[PDB]
Symmetry: C3
Subunit: 456 residues, 3 copies
């Protein structure tokens, strides 16, 4: 006996349902082995990795991660891979869980415009990463070529109310985090394992705000969690909750009641969550600078009745989530498009600045700019700002400490530098500030900030 | 039924006992749920991260890690957070193990001089990291804002003879490892996950030498081990022993009889150790350059009878532990204070040099400078040293190889460069050598070493 | 009762069998405790870390990893360590699994030309890393000073058909990956955890090609897998198969049916594999850039009958494995020796280029240079190449995009830059191309490529 030895395929061939993240195909719901036909197409395309930041992704099925594949242990899978004629590269696939050399790699080699096929029996139950296997393999994986395949046990997984698909990846851009424009792949950063972004589902904000996952108090949620890498290991964590179960790949071991769990590069797990009180629960890589400085956060939003005996506090806000507490940051997307066209208005900057000011500045200076008297000075109708509004550029980039006076009050505190903000972010935030709360108005341009960043 | 559903609180409210590392509050020792009141205050302050190296830590309760909190599963916790008026930043808290959004973050936002409160029921048993959750979150965590909370099971943990509290963290200074002075936080290093120090309990030597943890042969020791990060995953290991048990957070899985175990960023474990033979057992991050080049070592010292049938060897010494085999290195602290004052004496340098020479130089040249004839040349009454004592600076910084003669004996070997030693370390070591073992005397200054480091 | 309390030693002392990787000593096959005498000698020596790249390794027993030691739980081990007189450094050992301080470190300190000994009882069953423990510890470990010791349970491990020994390590060279010559240890890279190579068994290709491990369909294979570090954690994975069992050190927990598993720095595991279909199965660190850009791949080659009902595809090839699909790359070794001697022929370059062209260029331009019409242009009898063969250097280093014509066909595609190729690699590949497929002939030298790399 090999494992998964359930019989020869019965019935008619089934054309496999593939779904785009964050959704999952439905449970196969059958008691017999089948011949399952899978057709997956590779597409190379520019998408937004962040607001106003484009990247040329290489994809299985048009998304990052690629289409989710779901079969039953014991099935025979006929796997067709098409490489769209617009592709510039050849591609192939290695599916973890396949029994055989390269997990399909050699037989699935597929030049642009061609199709390949190989067949495999699904011997091993579990959740499994797949990815491209074409030299240079790391470049293909870094450009987005990974996804998950679930091989169900024969009796199926226990019923839950929702199933979702989330996959972490590390990305390597020539430019720095949130530097606008079309960003090429950066080999030197990738070789050093120094990613510029670390993301769930292929982009900043892919699962935050209006794109959050949903469920309700009392419901159970299953998440199929993959780490496509290429390089990082995820300290995968849920803020404000606990996983009832974590199960790696097809392992016999199941861990229960943990909140933080390590996912290897190329690894995958099924986690289970029971919603107990309402609010936003954040999935992160708890190597914290990834979560909070490189994009590695996703949200499961829960609706229903508060339970004050369990938790009396308020919903997550911009103090913790920063600029991702909002529904989106499309004002940034719009202001960047407008700069590229040469049609950038003051109001474009203002609305972009407003999006960016949340968390980043509001944590100390408040949402309304009032500050807190004696502790955090006001930006609302600030005489200090008005006295030399161009010095505000230096303050953002390089910080401010020492004694100062603002609206006739003394302050002796420290504003840390925020040098990681790109020129356009600083310009837009300051332009927002100048046009709010009865401040003088005017505008700061990215060119102005650039001049100041360059001053010793 | 939610978990931890034991009843409404009974009795009088309990004011929670918080302890400073490395100690732990005592077992709650009760059979009923209580309302537990926790008061924790944030304090920003300079402390010594290393000898003569100050750092502005942000702390829960005045220490890194912060005060340890201990409650019982099923308790209702009323959590008060005070931010001391000397603070420059606002702060808050996210406690892993809390059921609710942000783990307390939004309701615990607390400006300098203010107090906040929220209430939560402790549904989940286990050991859990807490940390600040204030944008920019990574900066707050990197500056020391983390600690542990234990939620006991209802029957309590099994009795052991000692309980200790150890928490790893990664730190990001503008200066290099052991560069003296007040070191600011370095954002670029933190974003790249390139820490300058990796520490247990907030400082080099915090748990070595005279600060070691203690127990005796036959006793059981429980250690609550946290990894506050922000970024690193610890290959947590005990040198010369084994953990009887390792249990992550509140997990149902318990691993037994391992010596090396991975702790995620933001993760925590309870480990158990049974002392079997006397000596020093070293807790490290076995990503070795952290343990031996960045400070990631702590010591559990065991007293009692030798058992020669089990182990015939000698106690740990400076060959392995380097300069941390000694009780402390306070001579370095003193010599650095003296340089800052402009009052540095030759004897100050000598005693600093002596502390630093252990391991670093003594492994080859021996504790008494004799060397080993033909293999390692002597520093004790060295004619080669005396012939040009200023060339000793180049030898330390850039190494020495090739044929040489010293006290009329031939040597053809390789002394590796030690360029990572800071100017003052080299000056002090050489000054020690010059004033020991009937060498010529004199002194080398940090300015001298600086001049030589700068020569091509 | 201590654990492993089986009695005082009986019979005659046994001189321990030590084996070189990838082999393992045989099972002790005994029912009583013994006094086991172990003699291990340290040797410092230059070996090839890669083709034409020498490195001064520090070794236990002449190999990296060091000799494998196998004893029975309950044995008393008398451990002799000799440091060969040619050594320049003192050395010692810390064996995980030893009960006692330093795991032997202090008593095993051994200068060049000397011998030391200590005795220990093997209380703890499992697989355990050993390594040198001599300041600076990280340098000694980085230079190759680690290996494995197995302490068998008293009844022995279950019988399998083959046992193998594989140990990952991270290496830090002054030069870049595949830069030729004698490469010194690089401390700054090591401190930053930025390795230039990541290897199984001490070298690129140590377990690929004609050095692969072997077994047959239906056979069971046990691999003792170590991670000597010094710094990296391995996302240890088998391509195209599954581990029936993974067991860390002496842990009671055994995980089954996984394909990817995290191995800590300093950790070790026993894995079990059952061969089900023929072909090459790749052991990698699935932090992918390590596997595919730094050398972290090894091969288990399986012989026997195909099973088309399980897997219909072809054997692994150069699309996935790149230049390690071949038996070896000794043409590179030879061409590098010839350059050092000043005797490099065109044919030397051609054969080196041929080795390197596999994967690296053949994935798009094909093994025969034909390309694919309209998609990948030909290198076979290429008029575009012939028109300006020196522009081929720029194409390799810096890529090519835009519209071009080659053998009267239009192309508008993208050839990515390959700037990580060293000067000699580029020269040799191009020299191969020029002398194949009726191309013009001639040669490109490393000096030519160097001149072009230096042009802005
Ligand atoms: C985010 C991008 C912003 C922007 C646009 C500003 N800040 Fe701050 N800030 C803080 C403190 C304590 C001070 C006083 C410094 C001192 O005592 O020396 C400041 C000062 C300023 C100014 C100048 C004064 C004014 O009120 O006009 C300006 C223009 C300014 N800030 C803009 C504190 C903080 C924070 C605390 C952690 C954070 C975050 C920010 N500031 C962020 C921003
Ligand atoms: C730590 C900071 C020190 C200091 C102050 C010195 N050493 Fe070494 N050393 C070693 C060897 C093999 C040599 C001979 C080199 C050769 O054969 O070419 C040396 C040489 C020196 C000298 C000059 C000779 C003398 O005896 O005066 C000096 C001044 C010196 N050392 C100081 C070997 C080692 C080590 C081996 C691994 C280590 C560690 C050190 N030395 C460290 C130091
Ligand atoms: C590995 C080292 C090699 C070598 C020696 C060459 N290539 Fe490529 N190449 C590719 C594509 C799409 C083009 C056309 C670019 C365009 O349309 O603008 C090229 C072009 C070349 C040339 C010039 C044209 C010719 O046929 O002579 C040469 C000399 C050349 N290549 C050599 C595609 C790829 C790959 C796709 C991913 C890879 C890998 C390589 N090339 C690698 C190499
Ligand atoms: Cu691809
Ligand atoms: Cu893979
Ligand atoms: Cu804080
Ligand atoms: Cu956290
Ligand atoms: Cu050594
Ligand atoms: Cu070790």
């Amino acid at each position: 006996k090999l494992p998964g030895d359930f019989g020869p395929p019965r019935g008619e061939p089934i054309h496999a349902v593939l779904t785009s993240p964050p959704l999952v195909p439905p449970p196969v719901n059958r008691t017999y082995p089948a011949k399952v036909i899978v057709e997956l197409e590779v597409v190379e395309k520019e998408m937004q990795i962040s607001e106003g930041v484009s990247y040329t992704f290489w994809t299985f099925g048009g998304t990052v991660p690629g289409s989710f594949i779901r079969v039953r242990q014991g099935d025979t899978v006929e796997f067709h891979l098409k490489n769209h004629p617009s592709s510039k590269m050849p591609h192939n696939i290695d599916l973890h869980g396949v029994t055989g050399p390269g997990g399909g790699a050699a037989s699935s080699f597929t030049a642009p415009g061609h199709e390949s096929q190989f067949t495999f029996k699904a011997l091993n139950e579990g959740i499994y990463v797949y990815h491209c296997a074409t030299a240079p393999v790391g470049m293909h994986i870094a450009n987005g070529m990974y996804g998950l395949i679930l091989v169900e046990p024969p009796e199926g997984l226990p019923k839950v109310d929702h199933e979702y698909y989330v996959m972490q990846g590390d990305f390597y851009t020539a430019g720095k985090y949130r530097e606008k424009g079309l960003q090429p792949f950066d080999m030197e950063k990738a070789i050093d394992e120094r990613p510029s972004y670390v993301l769930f589902n292929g982009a900043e904000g892919a699962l935050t705000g209006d794109k959050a996952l949903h469920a309700k108090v009392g419901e159970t949620v299953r998440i199929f969690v993959g780490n496509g890498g290429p390089n990082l290991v995820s300290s995968f964590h849920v803020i404000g909750a606990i996983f009832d179960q974590v199960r790696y790949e097809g392992g016999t071991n199941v861990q229960k009641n943990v909140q933080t769990t390590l996912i290897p590069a190329g690894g995958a797990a099924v986690v289970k969550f029971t919603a107990r009180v309402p609010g936003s629960y954040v999935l992160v890589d708890h190597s914290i600078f990834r979560a909070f400085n490189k994009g590695a956060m996703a949200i499961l939003k829960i609706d229903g009745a508060e339970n004050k005996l369990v938790y009396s506090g308020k919903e997550l806000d911009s103090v913790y989530l920063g600029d991702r507490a909002a529904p989106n940051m499309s004002a940034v997307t719009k202001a960047t498009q407008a700069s590229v066209s040469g049609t950038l208005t003051v109001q474009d900057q203002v609305q972009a600045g407003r999006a960016l000011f949340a968390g980043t500045c509001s944590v100390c200076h408040q949402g309304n700019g009032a500050g807190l008297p004696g502790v955090f000075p006001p930006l609302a109708k600030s005489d200090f700002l008005a006295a030399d509004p161009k010095r505000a550029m230096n303050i953002v980039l390089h910080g401010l400490n020492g004694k100062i006076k603002v609206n006739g009050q003394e302050y002796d505190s420290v504003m840390p530098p925020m040098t990681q903000l790109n020129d356009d972010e600083v310009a837009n935030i300051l332009t927002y500030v100048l046009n709010s709360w009865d401040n003088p108005g005017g505008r700061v341009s990215a060119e102005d900030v650039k001049k100041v960043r360059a001053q010793p």
